[PDB]
Design a protein around this ligand. Structure first.
Ligand code: HEM
Length: 153
């Protein structure tokens, strides 16, 4: 599970991430499209922004950019006693958005790499995994719920 040693560590860099929600976020976005162009069309808000440049260019997309952080800003803080947060994601994302855990794993991986560029030395040989176990718990507690959801797969 998550050791008392990295729960400040995975929440440390999210403290040091508390700095910019959008900038790291306007990034956690792109590696989800630029490694995965599909999650784009999957995000019908914007399917209409093809080119890479206009990305930091758009102001609204940035509107959504904090949201996820604010989710992680609610999620990560719980530290696994998060349960309060998980239903609303489990639902809007399964039923209304139709985005599976692998996209929400694509995003974890977007986030994960997106923290690498902004945070170099800040990123530990200990932080890498704290991100996963911290993500894998978020990813683990929704995919199990698509079972109470019937939308998993
Ligand atoms: C860090 C991972 C994720 C978190 C915390 C997150 C969080 C959120 C939140 C808080 C909202 C707005 C609430 C609403 O109106 O229902 C939202 C909306 C949305 N999300 Fe995510 N999301 C995540 C991953 C993804 C992924 C991987 C996709 C794949 C397409 C996605 C697609 C969407 C779409 C299409 C919307 C709808 C926007 C709207 O019209 O309001 N999300 N997400």
């Amino acid at each position: 599970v998550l050791s008392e040693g990295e729960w400040q560590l995975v929440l440390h860099v999210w403290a040091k991430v508390e700095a910019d929600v959008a900038g790291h976020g306007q990034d956690i976005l792109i590696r989800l499209f630029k490694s995965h162009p599909e999650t784009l069309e999957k995000f019908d808000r914007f399917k209409h922004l093809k080119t890479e440049a206009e990305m930091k260019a758009s102001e609204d997309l940035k509107k959504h950019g904090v949201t996820v952080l604010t989710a992680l800003g609610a999620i990560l803080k719980k530290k696994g006693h998060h349960e309060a947060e998980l239903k609303p994601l489990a639902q809007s994302h399964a039923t209304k958005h139709k985005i599976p855990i692998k996209y929400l794993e694509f995003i974890s991986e977007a986030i994960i790499h997106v923290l690498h560029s902004r945070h170099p030395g800040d990123f530990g040989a200990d932080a890498q995994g704290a991100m996963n176990k911290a993500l894998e718990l978020f990813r683990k507690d929704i995919a199990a719920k698509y079972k109470e959801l019937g939308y998993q797969g």
